Structure 1
Amino acid sequence: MAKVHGSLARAEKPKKPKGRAYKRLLYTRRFVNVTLVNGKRRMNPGPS
């Protein structure tokens, strides 16, 4: 909320890769590991 004043750079779920590695993760999500759901392309599946 209010950040503590020690934000001087000079002198929980695991984090999520960014940049090129995120494009790697989307490629291997969609096309390397194709999830065959009911004959269609279901992104974000629930309990089914």
Structure 2
Amino acid sequence: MAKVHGSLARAEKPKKPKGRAYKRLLYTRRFVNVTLVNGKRRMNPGPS
């Protein structure tokens, strides 16, 4: 909502990397460290 005047630049859980880095993450989330669940590639599962 209201960030106070102090947006003057000059004078929680872990974050996700941005840009290139993020893609890297995905490349290993899907191809270096493959997770084969129930005979399929499951993305976003809870308890199974």
Q: TM-score, normalised by structure 2?
A: 0.92
How far apart, in 2, do the equivalents of 1:19 and 1:32 lie? 19
How far apart, in 1, do the equivalents of 2:46 and 2:35 lie? 13
State the identity as a percent: 100
Q: Deviations over 1:26-46 (max 9, x none)?
A: 001000111010000110011
Alpha-carbon RMSD? 0.6
Which structure: greater strand fraction?
A: 2
Structure 1 moving runs of 4+ over 6 Å: none
Q: Deviations over 1:10-34 (max 9, x none)?
A: 1111111000000000001000111
How far apart, in 2, do the equivalents of 1:4 and 1:13 lie? 24
How far apart, in 2, do the equivalents of 1:46 and 1:33 lie? 18
Q: Which runs of 5+ in 2 are unaligned?
A: none
